[PDB]
Design an enzyme around this catalytic site. Structure first.
Site, PDB file in Angstrom:
ATOM      1  N   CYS A  14     -12.948 -36.822  25.533  1.00 14.29           N
ATOM      2  CA  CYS A  14     -12.189 -37.857  24.824  1.00 14.29           C
ATOM      3  C   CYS A  14     -10.695 -37.795  25.176  1.00 14.29           C
ATOM      4  O   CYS A  14      -9.880 -38.543  24.598  1.00 14.29           O
ATOM      5  CB  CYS A  14     -12.439 -37.741  23.318  1.00 14.29           C
ATOM      6  SG  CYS A  14     -11.533 -36.480  22.501  1.00 14.29           S
ATOM      7  N   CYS A  17      -8.393 -32.776  24.763  1.00 14.57           N
ATOM      8  CA  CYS A  17      -7.941 -31.475  25.234  1.00 14.57           C
ATOM      9  C   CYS A  17      -6.728 -31.571  26.158  1.00 14.57           C
ATOM     10  O   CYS A  17      -5.987 -30.594  26.278  1.00 14.57           O
ATOM     11  CB  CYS A  17      -9.115 -30.741  25.892  1.00 14.57           C
ATOM     12  SG  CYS A  17     -10.563 -30.528  24.782  1.00 14.57           S
ATOM     13  N   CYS A 117     -16.886 -29.505  24.140  1.00 14.33           N
ATOM     14  CA  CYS A 117     -17.755 -30.291  25.018  1.00 14.33           C
ATOM     15  C   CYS A 117     -18.114 -29.534  26.294  1.00 14.33           C
ATOM     16  O   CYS A 117     -19.293 -29.303  26.599  1.00 14.33           O
ATOM     17  CB  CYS A 117     -17.080 -31.625  25.352  1.00 14.33           C
ATOM     18  SG  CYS A 117     -17.030 -32.728  23.972  1.00 14.33           S
ATOM     19  N   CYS A 155     -12.304 -28.448  19.237  1.00 13.46           N
ATOM     20  CA  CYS A 155     -12.505 -29.897  19.375  1.00 13.46           C
ATOM     21  C   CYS A 155     -11.395 -30.569  18.605  1.00 13.46           C
ATOM     22  O   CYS A 155     -11.606 -31.123  17.513  1.00 13.46           O
ATOM     23  CB  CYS A 155     -13.875 -30.322  18.854  1.00 13.46           C
ATOM     24  SG  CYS A 155     -14.383 -31.956  19.300  1.00 13.46           S
ATOM     25  N   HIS A 204     -13.334 -16.970   7.792  1.00 13.67           N
ATOM     26  CA  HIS A 204     -13.616 -16.594   6.415  1.00 13.67           C
ATOM     27  C   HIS A 204     -13.073 -15.210   6.104  1.00 13.67           C
ATOM     28  O   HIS A 204     -12.386 -15.027   5.095  1.00 13.67           O
ATOM     29  CB  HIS A 204     -15.120 -16.678   6.180  1.00 13.67           C
ATOM     30  CG  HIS A 204     -15.532 -16.332   4.796  1.00 13.67           C
ATOM     31  ND1 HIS A 204     -15.189 -17.101   3.711  1.00 13.67           N
ATOM     32  CD2 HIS A 204     -16.327 -15.346   4.326  1.00 13.67           C
ATOM     33  CE1 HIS A 204     -15.705 -16.565   2.616  1.00 13.67           C
ATOM     34  NE2 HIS A 204     -16.399 -15.498   2.963  1.00 13.67           N
ATOM     35  N   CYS A 207      -9.440 -15.706   5.312  1.00 12.61           N
ATOM     36  CA  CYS A 207      -8.899 -16.929   4.709  1.00 12.61           C
ATOM     37  C   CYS A 207      -8.046 -16.561   3.499  1.00 12.61           C
ATOM     38  O   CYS A 207      -8.445 -15.697   2.700  1.00 12.61           O
ATOM     39  CB  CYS A 207     -10.030 -17.904   4.294  1.00 12.61           C
ATOM     40  SG  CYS A 207      -9.543 -19.492   3.508  1.00 12.61           S
ATOM     41  N   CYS A 228     -11.284 -22.249  -3.479  1.00 14.64           N
ATOM     42  CA  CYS A 228     -11.895 -22.188  -2.166  1.00 14.64           C
ATOM     43  C   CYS A 228     -12.603 -23.518  -1.884  1.00 14.64           C
ATOM     44  O   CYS A 228     -13.121 -24.192  -2.787  1.00 14.64           O
ATOM     45  CB  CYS A 228     -12.858 -20.997  -2.123  1.00 14.64           C
ATOM     46  SG  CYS A 228     -14.265 -20.989  -0.949  1.00 14.64           S
ATOM     47  N   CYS A 234     -16.709 -26.063   3.652  1.00 12.27           N
ATOM     48  CA  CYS A 234     -15.969 -25.218   4.580  1.00 12.27           C
ATOM     49  C   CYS A 234     -16.897 -24.316   5.386  1.00 12.27           C
ATOM     50  O   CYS A 234     -17.783 -23.659   4.848  1.00 12.27           O
ATOM     51  CB  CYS A 234     -14.950 -24.389   3.821  1.00 12.27           C
ATOM     52  SG  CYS A 234     -13.791 -23.589   4.937  1.00 12.27           S
ATOM     53  N   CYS A 243      -7.019 -20.042  13.428  1.00 14.30           N
ATOM     54  CA  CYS A 243      -6.161 -21.105  12.909  1.00 14.30           C
ATOM     55  C   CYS A 243      -5.531 -20.715  11.578  1.00 14.30           C
ATOM     56  O   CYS A 243      -4.478 -21.256  11.216  1.00 14.30           O
ATOM     57  CB  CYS A 243      -6.960 -22.391  12.715  1.00 14.30           C
ATOM     58  SG  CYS A 243      -8.129 -22.795  14.023  1.00 14.30           S
ATOM     59  N   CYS A 255      -6.782 -26.862   8.975  1.00 17.31           N
ATOM     60  CA  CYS A 255      -7.947 -27.607   8.475  1.00 17.31           C
ATOM     61  C   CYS A 255      -8.389 -27.127   7.095  1.00 17.31           C
ATOM     62  O   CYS A 255      -8.670 -27.952   6.217  1.00 17.31           O
ATOM     63  CB  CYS A 255      -9.109 -27.504   9.472  1.00 17.31           C
ATOM     64  SG  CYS A 255      -8.611 -28.010  11.209  1.00 17.31           S
ATOM     65  N   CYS A 261     -12.708 -26.433   7.145  1.00 17.25           N
ATOM     66  CA  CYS A 261     -13.054 -26.115   8.519  1.00 17.25           C
ATOM     67  C   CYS A 261     -14.417 -26.723   8.846  1.00 17.25           C
ATOM     68  O   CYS A 261     -15.394 -26.484   8.127  1.00 17.25           O
ATOM     69  CB  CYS A 261     -13.082 -24.596   8.689  1.00 17.25           C
ATOM     70  SG  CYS A 261     -13.539 -23.950  10.329  1.00 17.25           S
ATOM     71  N   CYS A 264     -15.227 -26.141  14.737  1.00 20.03           N
ATOM     72  CA  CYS A 264     -15.256 -26.922  15.979  1.00 20.03           C
ATOM     73  C   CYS A 264     -15.284 -26.049  17.225  1.00 20.03           C
ATOM     74  O   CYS A 264     -15.572 -26.558  18.316  1.00 20.03           O
ATOM     75  CB  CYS A 264     -14.067 -27.886  15.986  1.00 20.03           C
ATOM     76  SG  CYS A 264     -12.496 -27.098  16.177  1.00 20.03           S
TER      77      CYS A 264
HETATM   78  S1  SF4 Z   1     -11.908 -21.882   2.203  1.00 21.17           S
HETATM   79 FE1  SF4 Z   1     -13.612 -21.602   3.679  1.00 21.17          FE
HETATM   80  S2  SF4 Z   1     -12.904 -19.922   5.062  1.00 21.17           S
HETATM   81 FE2  SF4 Z   1     -11.754 -19.736   3.013  1.00 21.17          FE
HETATM   82  S3  SF4 Z   1     -12.886 -18.269   1.685  1.00 21.17           S
HETATM   83 FE3  SF4 Z   1     -13.438 -20.456   1.181  1.00 21.17          FE
HETATM   84  S4  SF4 Z   1     -15.361 -20.720   2.415  1.00 21.17           S
HETATM   85 FE4  SF4 Z   1     -14.222 -18.979   3.417  1.00 21.17          FE
HETATM   86  S1  SF4 Z   2     -12.380 -26.929  12.407  1.00 21.60           S
HETATM   87 FE1  SF4 Z   2     -12.101 -24.685  11.877  1.00 21.60          FE
HETATM   88  S2  SF4 Z   2     -12.106 -23.655  13.919  1.00 21.60           S
HETATM   89 FE2  SF4 Z   2     -11.747 -25.912  14.330  1.00 21.60          FE
HETATM   90  S3  SF4 Z   2      -9.512 -26.080  14.278  1.00 21.60           S
HETATM   91 FE3  SF4 Z   2     -10.128 -26.555  12.151  1.00 21.60          FE
HETATM   92  S4  SF4 Z   2      -9.985 -24.537  11.158  1.00 21.60           S
HETATM   93 FE4  SF4 Z   2      -9.940 -24.027  13.360  1.00 21.60          FE
END
Ligand code: SF4
Ligand code: SF4
Ligand code: FCO
Ligand SMILES: [Cl-]
Ligand SMILES: [Fe+2]
Ligand SMILES: [Kr]
Ligand SMILES: [Kr]
Ligand SMILES: [Kr]
Ligand SMILES: [Kr]
Ligand SMILES: [Kr]
Ligand SMILES: [Kr]
Ligand SMILES: [Kr]
Ligand SMILES: [Kr]
Ligand SMILES: [Kr]
Ligand SMILES: [Kr]
Ligand SMILES: [Kr]
Ligand SMILES: [Kr]
Ligand SMILES: [Kr]
Ligand SMILES: [Kr]
Ligand SMILES: [Kr]
Ligand SMILES: [Kr]
Ligand SMILES: [Kr]
Ligand SMILES: [Kr]
Ligand code: NI
Ligand SMILES: [S]
Lengths: 279, 482
Positions: A14, A17, A117, A155, A204, A207, A228, A234, A243, A255, A261, A264
């Site tokens: 797309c 990247c 991809c 991605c 995780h 996080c 959370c 997530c 990230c 994200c 999240c 990706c």
């Molecule tokens: S926001 Fe997502 S990565 Fe963070 S503790 Fe909760 S489930 Fe895990």
């Molecule tokens: S989707 Fe998850 S792994 Fe992909 S950029 Fe967002 S936080 Fe990072």
């Protein structure tokens, strides 16, 4: 030292990247292009065009056989004899991505499959697709090409993951020479071909809302940032990326903070990470 | 025969995979075919999924305009779910999306188009190029061009910081969903947004809009080619209220000198010259089907051929500034005078032929960038820290919806049909589909194929004006085929 020649070919991509790379902060993209690499072929940004652009890439490739780097963005479709991704035409004959990767892949020093991809098939290979979208490594192995491949997934990937992988590899080569360094590059790859500096840590496990996960405190609307995001979908628990620390677009967000999240960077993205908005 | 056929594959400094084939006679283009050469099939990938998955999946159609597809998607989802987006979330959507209009227009002129007129440094990717590349700027102006390209690399990155503040990241935002936006703006982040915005505002005002008019003045011949059908579509974008009535760009069609209102039922997609099953031709988007036919004789493209009441139309900044006929920027009013000796207040004062021209489309894009700065200022006035931006609707079992918006390159709609709480059909009609499509079933050419007619090719060894014309429409083939 010298800026190595790079060719950037797009399959079923797309262009995300390439855009994310333009967002690189330190070094900026201009420093990348003028001081780190010599980007000799890139259809989105290069001066020349058409058959002349391809013939320029082939002259550099002949000149620098075994010494040039090939970036592949997007997946490689093999159905219909590659007719789902024609990327050029020279000498009155169309060139598919299948053709191009068989031409250039065996003669590159290494191949960097950028994006999920290219690395793993991603959305073009997902349930519902019809094109034979194949990951770069699988395609190369499948046609018996042994060139080392590095996967930089996402991605899109974060710019730092792309630039960072390149600088690590070019320092490894400066240090050890070319065969030597590429062995050092391969040494830092996980079982999915990804560099462990960037994909070595689980989201995780790191996080900032891990306290809330453990407390069972879950947000019920996206706009509630206290809890959370697990119940909102997530996928941090099954995702290996950093990230959480470096964040995105000059660190202004990421994200999990903004939403969820969607995993990706992982080889099963997207189908194995869907539905995105239920756990 | 005196007809010489030139083929260009790839067309570079666009997005995506495009082959252009022209025929030249007496030094001018007399016939054209555009071939979008890459297919992924998002419309079949999406079937059977949770409908909320769509607002992520569809962004991966195009990493340059992912916020347009996001926006189109969540509007279709909103209608289908019955979701009443909160006002503060309508505006937050507008801020996420409007910011990528700035990134996309700056990306296009400087980093895609500007090398048509400006010689870069003597290193790849700026060399080699055509030996006779027709580059007219003085050493002084060319160095201006180069320094601004390099500055624009910072400016567009900052734009994506603006998108990301409330969007999570860019490309591919997490922040827009059915029901609104996922993150309420805080006082703090509104400050970070406005700080970045000002830098972009001043670069747009001081460098970008002047440089377009300045370079055009050195290429006045380029206002005299590229007219094609002089037909344009706008389907409305950036709602300003919560009733669906007022939009920053209001809908409309222009054809044969006639303004007319926009009726979406008059959209149909032809595939005679496209690589899809012959039995799927002529369908409106609510009945659309995507059955790939990569071996079908006569077909030359993965881009379907959309027609509006049988008209072949163009979309994008030109089309929107024409329909909506706003007032020109002050810098545009001045420089049109000093450099072209032209007096004009609103957009249509440039006249049909100059506006519907190769260099006219670049000018429209610069003017629309300025215009968007005002919109973003207004929404920055209007947004209110702390007010909720999203509701959390349930997935319907059965439902349909349509989202209409304008992507940086033109008109965009997503249509979704839900059945058993899953996507049953999802159809996309995108901007570069309207512009870069092949012939329809009636043999009528696509907009760009037609605008190519009469382009000068005085030197077949350096046919630089062919791709110059294409680049003026800002094509992205990812969006055209999806
Ligand atoms: S926001 Fe997502 S990565 Fe963070 S503790 Fe909760 S489930 Fe895990
Ligand atoms: S989707 Fe998850 S792994 Fe992909 S950029 Fe967002 S936080 Fe990072
Ligand atoms: N802008 C953009 Fe993408 C295209 N064409 C869409 O819709
Ligand atoms: Cl966009
Ligand atoms: Fe479509
Ligand atoms: Kr790039
Ligand atoms: Kr790009
Ligand atoms: Kr650069
Ligand atoms: Kr660039
Ligand atoms: Kr590279
Ligand atoms: Kr190629
Ligand atoms: Kr490698
Ligand atoms: Kr790079
Ligand atoms: Kr790179
Ligand atoms: Kr590495
Ligand atoms: Kr590299
Ligand atoms: Kr490498
Ligand atoms: Kr340039
Ligand atoms: Kr310039
Ligand atoms: Kr420029
Ligand atoms: Kr440059
Ligand atoms: Kr307008
Ligand atoms: Kr003009
Ligand atoms: Ni696009
Ligand atoms: S795009």
């Amino acid at each position: 030292g010298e800026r190595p020649p790079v060719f950037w070919l797009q399959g079923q991509g797309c262009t995300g990247c390439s855009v994310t790379l333009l967002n690189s902060v330190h070094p900026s993209i201009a420093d990348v292009l003028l001081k780190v690499i010599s980007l000799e072929f890139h259809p989105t940004v290069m001066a020349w065009e058409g058959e002349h652009a391809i013939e320029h890439m082939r002259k550099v490739a002949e000149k620098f056989k075994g010494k040039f780097f090939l970036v592949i963005e997007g997946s490689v479709p093999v159905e219909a004899d590659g007719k789902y991704c024609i990327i050029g035409e020279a000498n009155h004959h169309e060139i598919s991505m299948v053709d191009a990767l068989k031409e250039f892949g065996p003669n590159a020093a290494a191949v960097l499959a950028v994006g999920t991809c290219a690395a793993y098939g991603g959305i073009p290979a997902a349930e519902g697709s019809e094109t034979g979208a194949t990951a770069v490594s699988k395609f190369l192995g499948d046609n018996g090409i042994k060139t080392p491949v590095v996967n930089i997934p996402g991605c899109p990937p974060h710019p730092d993951w792309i630039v960072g992988t390149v600088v690590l590899a070019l320092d490894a080569i400066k240090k050890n020479g070319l065969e030597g360094g590429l062995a050092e590059v391969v040494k830092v790859l996980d079982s999915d071909g990804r560099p462990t500096p960037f994909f070595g840590r689980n989201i995780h496990e790191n996080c900032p809302y891990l306290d809330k996960y453990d407390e069972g405190v879950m947000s019920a609307t996206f706009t509630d940032k206290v809890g959370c995001r697990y119940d909102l979908g997530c996928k941090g628990p099954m995702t290996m990326a950093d990230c959480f620390e470096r964040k995105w677009n000059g660190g202004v967000n990421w994200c999990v903070q903004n939403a969820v999240c969607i995993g990706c960077v992982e080889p099963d993205f997207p189908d194995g990470k869907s539905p995105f908005y239920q756990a | 025969t005196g007809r010489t056929t030139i083929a260009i594959d790839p067309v570079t400094r666009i997005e995506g995979h495009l082959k252009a084939e022209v025929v030249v006679e007496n030094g001018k283009v007399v016939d054209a075919r555009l071939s979008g050469g890459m297919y992924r099939g998002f419309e079949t990938i999406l079937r059977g999924r949770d409908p909320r998955d769509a607002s992520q999946i569809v962004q991966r159609i195009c990493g340059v305009c992912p916020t347009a597809h996001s926006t189109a998607s969540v509007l279709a989802l909103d209608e289908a779910f019955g979701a009443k987006v909160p006002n503060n979330g309508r505006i937050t959507r507008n801020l996420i999306f409007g910011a990528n209009y700035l990134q996309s227009h700056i990306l296009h002129f400087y980093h895609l188009s500007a090398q048509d007129f400006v010689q870069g440094p003597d290193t790849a990717p700026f060399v080699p190029r055509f030996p006779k590349s027709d580059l007219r700027l003085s050493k002084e102006l060319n160095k201006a061009g180069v320094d601004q390209y390099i500055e624009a690399l910072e400016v567009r990155r900052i734009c994506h910081e603006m998108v990301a503040l409330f969007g999570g990241r860019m490309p591919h935002v997490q922040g827009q969903v059915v029901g609104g936006a996922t993150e309420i703006p805080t006082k703090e982040k509104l400050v970070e947004y406005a700080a970045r915005f000002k830098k972009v505002r001043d670069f747009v005002e001081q460098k970008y809009v002047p440089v377009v008019y300045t370079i055009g003045s050195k290429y006045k011949d380029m206002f005299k080619v590229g007219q094609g059908f002089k037909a344009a579509l706008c389907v409305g974008a950036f709602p300003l209220d919560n009733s669906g009535k007022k939009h920053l760009f209001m809908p409309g069609v222009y054809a044969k000198g006639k303004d007319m209102p926009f009726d979406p039922s008059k959209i149909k997609e032809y595939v005679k010259y496209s690589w899809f099953a012959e039995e799927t031709t002529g369908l409106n988007y609510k009945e659309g089907k995507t059955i790939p036919a990569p071996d079908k004789a006569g077909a030359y493209s993965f881009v379907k051929a959309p027609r509006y009441d049988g008209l072949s139309l163009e979309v994008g900044p030109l089309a929107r500034m024409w329909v909506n006929n706003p007032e020109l920027s002050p810098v545009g009013k001045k420089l049109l005078k000093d450099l072209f000796g032209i007096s004009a207040k609103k957009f249509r004062d440039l006249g049909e032929e100059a506006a519907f021209s190769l260099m006219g489309r670049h000018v429209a894009r610069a003017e629309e960038t300025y215009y968007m700065l005002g919109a973003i200022e207004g929404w920055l006035k209007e947004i209110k820290a702390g007010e909720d931006t999203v509701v959390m609707p349930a997935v319907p079992a059965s439902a349909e919806g349509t989202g209409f918006t304008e992507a940086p390159r033109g008109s965009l709609l997503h249509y979704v049909k839900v059945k058993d709480s899953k996507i049953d059909n999802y159809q996309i009609v995108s901007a570069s589909l309207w512009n870069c499509n092949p012939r329809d079933d009636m043999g009528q050419r696509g907009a760009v194929e037609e605008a190519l007619i009469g382009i000068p090719v005085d030197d077949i060894q350096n046919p630089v004006n062919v791709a110059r014309l294409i680049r003026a429409f800002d094509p992205x083939l990812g969006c055209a085929v999806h």
